[PDB]
């Protein structure tokens, strides 16, 4: 229908523990939420930008700005709107993928609710539940790490992903392997921390049988990744580099990636994410669902996406309580190492308005 | 859902004119129809198989057979069913793609009718109408062809496609080009009638500025097509060879194709066809909508498909009256060279059930 | 001569043991036989299609149908016929290779009987006997398989091939290698059960010195096999993929295969199988004779084929009693690990009619 | 079956006109015939070697010598002979392909006569007649060439092949094209007379639309031929270089050849030639049947072979009278540009004994 307006909210949520990555430590999660309003009713979008431009060039205040002043006005000016039409209507604006994706999610959730159709149904789900791995930060000490991993294993997460960076790579892997053995599904994630000159150091990870090293080098260095793959045994996985289905196709032709992490906001929305799934499937490349420490709306959408057929490695969509004591929707609870795929219309979750209000820091209408 | 069963009907409809291709002439179009019945209501699929195994290894009685004894049962035995789920349920059965596609189409029309959503919406349409070309058969004499062509250009069709075979290639193209000039969008299609040995002959098309030559060699000879592309100026388009998204990705990697003809039945479904579109888009390969001389059901499904964003060349989805004096649904009518995209739920068209019956041959209930 | 007509029989013979493959369990062997009739005399052909389309798109009922309504008629309409001329006379029909091969086999046995020549002599045999291995199905438990294999070695079979599937690969192999040691010629066969995503699992085969792994991926994924070959140590062998001498040439050019399994019916006849053998020999690629659990008619022909110079690995053509209590011809009996090559005219073997009668289920005469 | 022995004949037949190639002129055809004698009957083989080692390293006296002292004893020492087993029985002897193929032809003719089967049926024939071209020698003057080509065209040959060499390439092809037009199937053959340094001279053939240039470079220069193909428009055809099916696979893989000339003697026999035909067809490479100015025997086997499905270009198997006033078998006569495929058992022809006797200069029996 014609979109009436969009309500944009700043939202802040404490983390159960600080989460430390190669680019820093956050203790809180700030995020934007969008609520699209149509004659038909309503839809929810979550943006995955972080507070400052440390993971990619996009950040909360920048997403909000491009949202208020470009993206939202362009959709409000359109005659008939459809999730699929969002992309062409926003095409003239370069980049701003996470902001575009957030807004596409909200249009999609509104549309789908109006057709009593789930996200899972629209995306092409073949599974009622998905297996879930867990992502683990850099720690101050090896023993703090072992106890943390140990804990996650006990609750039955199927795979352990370790954040790494120079000075924290080989040792923490060695120690996790000595304590928990060669059978645990183990992978590493640099968030762009190394260079091609670090190859011999990343080769010292060969003896530990990791599933993948995720984004060892910078976002723009795709040829460098192909070069690095000729020198290390650990399969390369790309995250920040995979900004679109075309980018996935390019990386695969160039021998720069054997496994692709998918994050919907990173590629510009759930529709593009599906295309990425499909392009990868066609080239025989396994995909998995990435996590941006989303609240329950984004987690719901990701759980759905993650049940597509080519998702053949456990994703990062951990249960609500891996990050939050109190989520803003009905929480996701781990159950035999798995999470259930949401069932109702659209996302199949909405925010509980008392909980959302506690953690809303600002609210603006754009109409 | 749970499927109740499927009415499998043999139909047969006369053509305005006999249609001559490199593999034969048919004067009449015979097909299967499937009416799937669920609790949520009912959907129509059309099968694209022809009478004998002359285009591919699949044909009417053979589809009908694999459908009755293999496919339709495996769906009837299923706990829950979605369009998406058809593929993995039918996966143990090798081949029979056109059959599987007719079935998925029927399930899909059911599903979408049950959510008041169009084919256009589910597939990701960005456009209300598609530009339309026509396919012109082999004729007895050059002047008989030059009239037929004259005619369709008069009706406002935007591109001409000519069936070609050894004996009927350079002369028809030279004549069409002498009669109608260089601005006409012109291409040829061989339905596998040449070998690599005929490259010098095909290179004789070089001066007529054709958009493409569609399937010059056999279905299996992907590498042969990449070889051929080194020897002739006319871009290669593939049809019979493009059996899946994976086969499209293979052919593009090998340099065997520059432009892909999409036929949803050939690739085993409208959902797979969507994947072929996205794989091609990600490699910068233009696609166009192919035609198996379907009724208004398949035509409705194809025009919806053809309105996807990477369909950037004119399809073969011609007006209903190009093939049939009367169609089994509301007819499609050319209007400034375009066909308009169906609006209502599912296909947005349904068999006028008096009209179906004048042209039906057999009926069987599987249940 | 001119062909008078063909007798088609459906036949059904119990198996000595159920045979389990990644696509299912066989307890009984259902097949078509063909008796071609000429003024001269008559010949026997065997179809290798199985009950339903789980190995390829071809099955018992669809072979029979394409035979009666397309293949056999086109030969009866023919003036002069030779085995060599079958191919161009059936060329207008796509696919149905197993059906075409059954028919060419019958024509060939008639033609050769009338010149008093063995299949061996026609095909180019250079050996009087051939070494034989055995194919061993998926077992319920490791000890059971260890007993079955133990039995087959004791009878003096020269090589063991184990069927494998996700769940049944590294353990069986490890087990077989523990009880019987590193000198036994051992290899595996997946019948398409893996994707390229399972490369790490398949590389877990590396230490066991397998001669080859047969068809790890789907029939159509030729490039996927070359990708997989860069990732594992075990040589790749193709079966389902090798449908022609041309498909074998392509797969060799792409690096997709290192050893080729030849099955006459899969490739559309003994004459095409001879071409496959010569194409691989010219490229230095070893071939070996595959088995389709044929009656002794097929087995006689396979044994003749397997005696060509480039069959330098042991074939799957086991003794009649590895599958059948009671063959329909004088049985093949293993002797110093070899089968002897048949000597008389044609197959050098014919159905014993009392026996052929107990196991016949239907009969039809095409004239 | 044991081979009983082989009668070896030297034969000399005059040519109707002297035949000139980049390696010389022949006005007489000297050749070897073999009559293999088995308990099941007789067969005829023809050796394609020429008098001296100017086309390849094999020649009539070398072929006779290797036959008497190596090839024939190995087959006579054998326990079982079939045509297929000839190859492994002789595999220890390196080279001598023309000599081996002559012996294989005779053995195969004997085996096929005994089963009452034609060469055509054993090879896989799919046609009853085959279109024929003519090979035209180097002449002293253009007008002599144009008269000769003019004559073969009136007789109905469907394709002209011109022998060429440095000094006789662009001009004859220019003339032939001016006199007879752009429609005539026209091709050239150098018999190794060029080097890669001559690529600019050979690119001067680009405007004339030739079907192919046959063997512009030496036998061993497979890489040089792939380089030459990057420089000229005329498709490359190989002849001397194609010595086996494997050599054909190799040249194709290297981009050295677009079209293959098959000569059965050159590849070591009709069975190997069937194999070259199959390898080429699997790669999309058209083949055509070559001619070594055989008598009716080799001509009969070549017409049979030329009727295989991948021979999609006209061969050099001209009518008997293009070379010989009197053939030693029933002669081959052109008819609507075609030759008919022989029909009876074996070759389908046999020497007329009085004619063979007029033309035999020596005969020796080689037995156990
Ligand atoms: C889920 C995971 O382990 N890492 C994400 C990115 C990430 C990293 C740091 C974050 C800090 C604040 C909010 C979101 C964040 C997301 C990744 O795959 O790289
Ligand atoms: C639309 C077009 O020009 N032809 C189809 C082939 C085709 C398809 C189905 C047919 C059914 C009956 C008779 C002829 C047919 C030809 C194609 O693109 O190859
Ligand atoms: C000899 C070997 O191991 N099997 C064949 C395939 C095969 C498999 C299962 C069958 C079941 C019923 C009838 C025929 C069958 C043929 C193969 O190599 O793939
Ligand atoms: C038929 C054709 O034009 N020439 C053959 C070879 C050839 C050339 C010269 C010869 C002289 C005497 C006897 C046999 C010969 C054969 C060729 O293609 O090269
Ligand atoms: Mg990451
Ligand atoms: Mg087409
Ligand atoms: Mg197999
Ligand atoms: Mg030559």
């Amino acid at each position: 229908m014609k979109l009436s307006g969009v309500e944009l909210r700043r939202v802040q949520m404490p983390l159960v523990a600080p989460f430390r990555t190669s680019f820093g430590t956050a203790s809180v999660r700030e995020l934007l939420l969008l609520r699209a309003v149509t004659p038909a009713g309503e839809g929810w979008g979550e943006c995955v930008t972080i507070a400052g431009p440390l993971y990619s060039s996009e950040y909360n205040d920048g997403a909000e700005h491009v949202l208020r002043h470009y993206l939202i006005p362009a959709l409000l000016a359109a005659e008939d709107i459809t999730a699929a039409k969002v992309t062409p209507l926003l095409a003239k604006f370069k980049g701003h993928r996470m902001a575009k994706g957030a807004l596409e999610m909200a249009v999609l959730d509104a549309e789908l609710r109006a057709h009593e159709r789930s996200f899972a149904a629209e995306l092409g789900s073949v599974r009622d539940s998905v297996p879930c791995g867990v992502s683990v930060g850099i720690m101050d000490t090896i023993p703090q790490l072992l106890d943390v991993v140990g804990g996650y294993l006990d609750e039955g997460y199927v795979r352990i992903k370790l954040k790494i960076e120079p000075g924290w790579d080989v040792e923490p892997v060695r120690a996790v392997r000595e304590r928990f053995g060669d059978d645990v599904l183990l992978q590493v994630d640099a968030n762009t921390a190394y260079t091609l000159g670090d190859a011999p150091q990343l080769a010292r990870l060969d003896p530990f049988g990791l599933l993948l090293i995720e984004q060892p080098l910078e976002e723009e260095d795709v040829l460098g990744h192909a070069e690095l793959a000729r020198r290390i045994q650990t399969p390369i996985c790309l995250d920040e580099s995979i900004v679109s289905a075309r980018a996935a196709a390019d990386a695969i032709k160039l021998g720069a990636v054997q496994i692709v992490n998918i994050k919907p906001g990173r590629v510009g929305g759930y529709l593009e994410a599906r295309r990425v799934h499909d392009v990868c499937a066609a080239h025989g490349i396994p995909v998995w669902c990435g996590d941006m420490i989303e609240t329950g709306l984004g987690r719901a959408a990701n759980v759905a996406l993650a049940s597509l057929p080519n998702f053949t490695l456990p994703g990062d969509t951990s249960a609500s309580d891996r990050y939050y004591k109190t989520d803003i929707t009905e929480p996701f609870v781990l159950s035999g190492g798995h999470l259930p795929v949401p069932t109702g219309p659209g996302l199949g979750v909405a925010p509980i308005p008392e909980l959302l209000d506690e953690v809303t820091t600002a609210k603006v209408w754009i109409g």
Side-chain angles (χ1 to χ4, degrees), chain A residues 12 20 29-30 40 43 63 68 75 145 159 161 193 205 214 218 232 238 253 303 314 352:
Chain A
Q12 186 174 315
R20 184 183 154 188
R29 219 285 185 219
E30 309 147 27
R68 273 166 140 295
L75 297 190
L145 174 73
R159 177 217 82 195
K161 164 187 157 165
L205 302 172
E214 184 182 353
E218 63 184 27
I232 67 172
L238 290 173
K253 289 188 270 196
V303 164
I352 304 153

mmCIF file of all heavy atoms in Angstrom, chain A residues 12 20 29-30 40 43 63 68 75 145 159 161 193 205 214 218 232 238 253 303 314 352:
data_model
loop_
_atom_site.group_PDB
_atom_site.id
_atom_site.type_symbol
_atom_site.label_atom_id
_atom_site.label_comp_id
_atom_site.label_asym_id
_atom_site.label_seq_id
_atom_site.Cartn_x
_atom_site.Cartn_y
_atom_site.Cartn_z
ATOM 1 N N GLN A 12 18.555 1.113 24.000
ATOM 2 C CA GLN A 12 19.805 0.640 24.604
ATOM 3 C C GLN A 12 19.595 -0.510 25.599
ATOM 4 O O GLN A 12 18.722 -0.441 26.459
ATOM 5 C CB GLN A 12 20.549 1.809 25.249
ATOM 6 C CG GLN A 12 21.902 1.421 25.773
ATOM 7 C CD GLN A 12 22.691 2.612 26.271
ATOM 8 O OE1 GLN A 12 22.749 3.669 25.630
ATOM 9 N NE2 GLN A 12 23.325 2.437 27.414
ATOM 10 N N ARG A 20 34.110 -8.508 23.672
ATOM 11 C CA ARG A 20 35.293 -7.927 23.140
ATOM 12 C C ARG A 20 35.715 -8.609 21.854
ATOM 13 O O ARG A 20 35.939 -9.821 21.818
ATOM 14 C CB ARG A 20 36.445 -7.946 24.166
ATOM 15 C CG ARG A 20 37.720 -7.257 23.678
ATOM 16 C CD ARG A 20 38.787 -7.382 24.711
ATOM 17 N NE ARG A 20 40.109 -7.322 24.086
ATOM 18 C CZ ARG A 20 41.236 -7.568 24.751
ATOM 19 N NH1 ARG A 20 41.143 -7.886 26.061
ATOM 20 N NH2 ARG A 20 42.444 -7.566 24.131
ATOM 21 N N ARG A 29 24.372 -2.527 24.118
ATOM 22 C CA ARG A 29 24.028 -2.558 22.721
ATOM 23 C C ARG A 29 23.068 -1.418 22.477
ATOM 24 O O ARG A 29 21.994 -1.394 23.117
ATOM 25 C CB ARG A 29 23.369 -3.912 22.352
ATOM 26 C CG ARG A 29 23.768 -4.493 20.979
ATOM 27 C CD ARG A 29 23.093 -3.758 19.842
ATOM 28 N NE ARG A 29 23.395 -4.388 18.566
ATOM 29 C CZ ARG A 29 23.633 -3.728 17.419
ATOM 30 N NH1 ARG A 29 23.662 -2.395 17.375
ATOM 31 N NH2 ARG A 29 23.852 -4.404 16.299
ATOM 32 N N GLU A 30 23.465 -0.443 21.624
ATOM 33 C CA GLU A 30 22.509 0.547 21.066
ATOM 34 C C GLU A 30 22.211 0.182 19.638
ATOM 35 O O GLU A 30 23.089 -0.293 18.885
ATOM 36 C CB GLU A 30 22.984 1.997 21.002
ATOM 37 C CG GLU A 30 23.564 2.620 22.242
ATOM 38 C CD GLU A 30 24.651 3.614 21.883
ATOM 39 O OE1 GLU A 30 24.576 4.196 20.727
ATOM 40 O OE2 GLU A 30 25.574 3.758 22.752
ATOM 41 N N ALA A 40 -2.772 -0.902 6.051
ATOM 42 C CA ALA A 40 -2.837 -2.328 6.458
ATOM 43 C C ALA A 40 -2.516 -2.696 7.954
ATOM 44 O O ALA A 40 -2.820 -3.806 8.381
ATOM 45 C CB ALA A 40 -2.004 -3.181 5.486
ATOM 46 N N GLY A 43 4.694 -2.781 10.683
ATOM 47 C CA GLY A 43 5.857 -3.660 10.716
ATOM 48 C C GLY A 43 7.113 -3.178 11.430
ATOM 49 O O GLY A 43 7.354 -1.999 11.446
ATOM 50 N N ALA A 63 23.232 5.983 10.227
ATOM 51 C CA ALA A 63 22.003 5.307 9.782
ATOM 52 C C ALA A 63 20.767 6.196 10.051
ATOM 53 O O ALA A 63 19.942 6.441 9.164
ATOM 54 C CB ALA A 63 21.870 3.929 10.391
ATOM 55 N N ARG A 68 16.332 9.427 8.035
ATOM 56 C CA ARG A 68 15.355 10.524 8.212
ATOM 57 C C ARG A 68 15.323 11.339 6.969
ATOM 58 O O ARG A 68 14.237 11.861 6.598
ATOM 59 C CB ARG A 68 15.767 11.523 9.280
ATOM 60 C CG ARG A 68 15.392 11.285 10.724
ATOM 61 C CD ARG A 68 16.242 12.259 11.567
ATOM 62 N NE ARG A 68 15.559 12.894 12.703
ATOM 63 C CZ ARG A 68 14.539 13.750 12.609
ATOM 64 N NH1 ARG A 68 14.012 14.099 11.440
ATOM 65 N NH2 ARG A 68 14.020 14.240 13.710
ATOM 66 N N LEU A 75 10.597 6.526 0.248
ATOM 67 C CA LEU A 75 9.496 5.554 0.272
ATOM 68 C C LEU A 75 8.140 6.232 0.469
ATOM 69 O O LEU A 75 7.159 5.805 -0.118
ATOM 70 C CB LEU A 75 9.709 4.471 1.320
ATOM 71 C CG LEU A 75 10.941 3.602 1.091
ATOM 72 C CD1 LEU A 75 10.978 2.374 2.014
ATOM 73 C CD2 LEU A 75 11.066 3.267 -0.390
ATOM 74 N N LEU A 145 38.705 -17.795 29.570
ATOM 75 C CA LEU A 145 38.159 -18.246 28.270
ATOM 76 C C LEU A 145 37.624 -19.665 28.327
ATOM 77 O O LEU A 145 36.487 -19.888 27.888
ATOM 78 C CB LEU A 145 39.184 -18.115 27.113
ATOM 79 C CG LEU A 145 38.869 -18.661 25.691
ATOM 80 C CD1 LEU A 145 37.842 -17.851 24.896
ATOM 81 C CD2 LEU A 145 40.153 -18.769 24.905
ATOM 82 N N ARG A 159 28.595 -25.529 18.297
ATOM 83 C CA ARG A 159 29.848 -24.999 17.753
ATOM 84 C C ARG A 159 30.299 -23.763 18.560
ATOM 85 O O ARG A 159 29.460 -22.926 18.982
ATOM 86 C CB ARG A 159 29.603 -24.581 16.280
ATOM 87 C CG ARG A 159 30.802 -23.948 15.591
ATOM 88 C CD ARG A 159 30.283 -22.855 14.692
ATOM 89 N NE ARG A 159 30.051 -21.673 15.481
ATOM 90 C CZ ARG A 159 29.340 -20.618 15.108
ATOM 91 N NH1 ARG A 159 28.778 -20.575 13.919
ATOM 92 N NH2 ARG A 159 29.216 -19.590 15.948
ATOM 93 N N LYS A 161 32.684 -20.403 18.296
ATOM 94 C CA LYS A 161 33.440 -19.426 17.510
ATOM 95 C C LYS A 161 34.248 -18.516 18.455
ATOM 96 O O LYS A 161 33.681 -17.866 19.331
ATOM 97 C CB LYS A 161 32.469 -18.635 16.595
ATOM 98 C CG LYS A 161 33.016 -17.345 16.007
ATOM 99 C CD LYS A 161 31.879 -16.649 15.295
ATOM 100 C CE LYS A 161 32.079 -15.152 15.128
ATOM 101 N NZ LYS A 161 31.127 -14.540 14.110
ATOM 102 N N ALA A 193 41.542 -8.064 11.393
ATOM 103 C CA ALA A 193 42.733 -7.748 12.198
ATOM 104 C C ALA A 193 44.122 -8.068 11.625
ATOM 105 O O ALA A 193 45.123 -7.560 12.137
ATOM 106 C CB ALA A 193 42.608 -8.376 13.578
ATOM 107 N N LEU A 205 47.893 -21.884 12.846
ATOM 108 C CA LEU A 205 46.567 -22.469 13.177
ATOM 109 C C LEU A 205 46.213 -23.764 12.433
ATOM 110 O O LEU A 205 45.233 -24.434 12.811
ATOM 111 C CB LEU A 205 45.430 -21.477 12.996
ATOM 112 C CG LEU A 205 45.447 -20.176 13.773
ATOM 113 C CD1 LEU A 205 44.315 -19.245 13.304
ATOM 114 C CD2 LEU A 205 45.340 -20.499 15.243
ATOM 115 N N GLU A 214 37.267 -16.728 9.717
ATOM 116 C CA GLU A 214 36.432 -15.668 9.234
ATOM 117 C C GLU A 214 37.140 -14.257 9.164
ATOM 118 O O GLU A 214 37.720 -13.781 10.167
ATOM 119 C CB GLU A 214 35.223 -15.626 10.140
ATOM 120 C CG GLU A 214 34.118 -14.638 9.783
ATOM 121 C CD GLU A 214 32.972 -14.664 10.814
ATOM 122 O OE1 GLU A 214 32.950 -15.538 11.737
ATOM 123 O OE2 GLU A 214 32.069 -13.792 10.750
ATOM 124 N N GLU A 218 41.352 -7.130 5.615
ATOM 125 C CA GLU A 218 40.404 -5.988 5.516
ATOM 126 C C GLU A 218 39.281 -6.279 4.479
ATOM 127 O O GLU A 218 39.451 -7.113 3.509
ATOM 128 C CB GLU A 218 41.139 -4.633 5.245
ATOM 129 C CG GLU A 218 41.884 -4.669 3.878
ATOM 130 C CD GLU A 218 42.741 -3.433 3.511
ATOM 131 O OE1 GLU A 218 43.214 -2.739 4.443
ATOM 132 O OE2 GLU A 218 42.957 -3.165 2.281
ATOM 133 N N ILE A 232 47.481 -21.017 3.789
ATOM 134 C CA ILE A 232 47.068 -21.570 5.103
ATOM 135 C C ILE A 232 46.138 -22.742 4.842
ATOM 136 O O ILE A 232 45.556 -22.809 3.739
ATOM 137 C CB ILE A 232 46.441 -20.516 6.060
ATOM 138 C CG1 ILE A 232 45.101 -19.994 5.546
ATOM 139 C CG2 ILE A 232 47.423 -19.356 6.262
ATOM 140 C CD1 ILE A 232 44.420 -19.125 6.578
ATOM 141 N N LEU A 238 34.169 -15.343 4.695
ATOM 142 C CA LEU A 238 34.173 -13.889 4.583
ATOM 143 C C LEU A 238 32.922 -13.385 5.235
ATOM 144 O O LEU A 238 31.914 -14.053 5.174
ATOM 145 C CB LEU A 238 34.245 -13.372 3.134
ATOM 146 C CG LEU A 238 35.587 -13.591 2.402
ATOM 147 C CD1 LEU A 238 35.430 -13.174 0.927
ATOM 148 C CD2 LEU A 238 36.748 -12.775 3.002
ATOM 149 N N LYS A 253 34.423 -16.591 -7.556
ATOM 150 C CA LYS A 253 35.226 -16.722 -8.835
ATOM 151 C C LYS A 253 36.707 -16.533 -8.572
ATOM 152 O O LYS A 253 37.510 -17.170 -9.186
ATOM 153 C CB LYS A 253 34.836 -15.688 -9.863
ATOM 154 C CG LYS A 253 33.468 -15.934 -10.480
ATOM 155 C CD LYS A 253 33.208 -14.996 -11.644
ATOM 156 C CE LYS A 253 32.556 -13.714 -11.175
ATOM 157 N NZ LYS A 253 31.921 -12.914 -12.277
ATOM 158 N N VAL A 303 16.506 -16.362 12.448
ATOM 159 C CA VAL A 303 16.266 -17.775 12.726
ATOM 160 C C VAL A 303 15.523 -18.344 11.502
ATOM 161 O O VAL A 303 15.869 -19.432 10.989
ATOM 162 C CB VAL A 303 15.528 -17.994 14.058
ATOM 163 C CG1 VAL A 303 14.944 -19.417 14.158
ATOM 164 C CG2 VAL A 303 16.500 -17.810 15.218
ATOM 165 N N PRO A 314 26.302 -24.507 11.478
ATOM 166 C CA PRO A 314 25.597 -23.847 12.559
ATOM 167 C C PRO A 314 25.928 -22.337 12.542
ATOM 168 O O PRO A 314 27.096 -21.955 12.384
ATOM 169 C CB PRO A 314 26.216 -24.465 13.807
ATOM 170 C CG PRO A 314 27.109 -25.584 13.383
ATOM 171 C CD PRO A 314 27.348 -25.462 11.934
ATOM 172 N N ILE A 352 7.250 -6.473 23.298
ATOM 173 C CA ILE A 352 6.334 -6.312 24.445
ATOM 174 C C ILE A 352 6.453 -4.850 24.917
ATOM 175 O O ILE A 352 7.530 -4.477 25.388
ATOM 176 C CB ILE A 352 6.625 -7.305 25.581
ATOM 177 C CG1 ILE A 352 6.580 -8.757 25.047
ATOM 178 C CG2 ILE A 352 5.607 -7.096 26.711
ATOM 179 C CD1 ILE A 352 7.439 -9.739 25.848
#
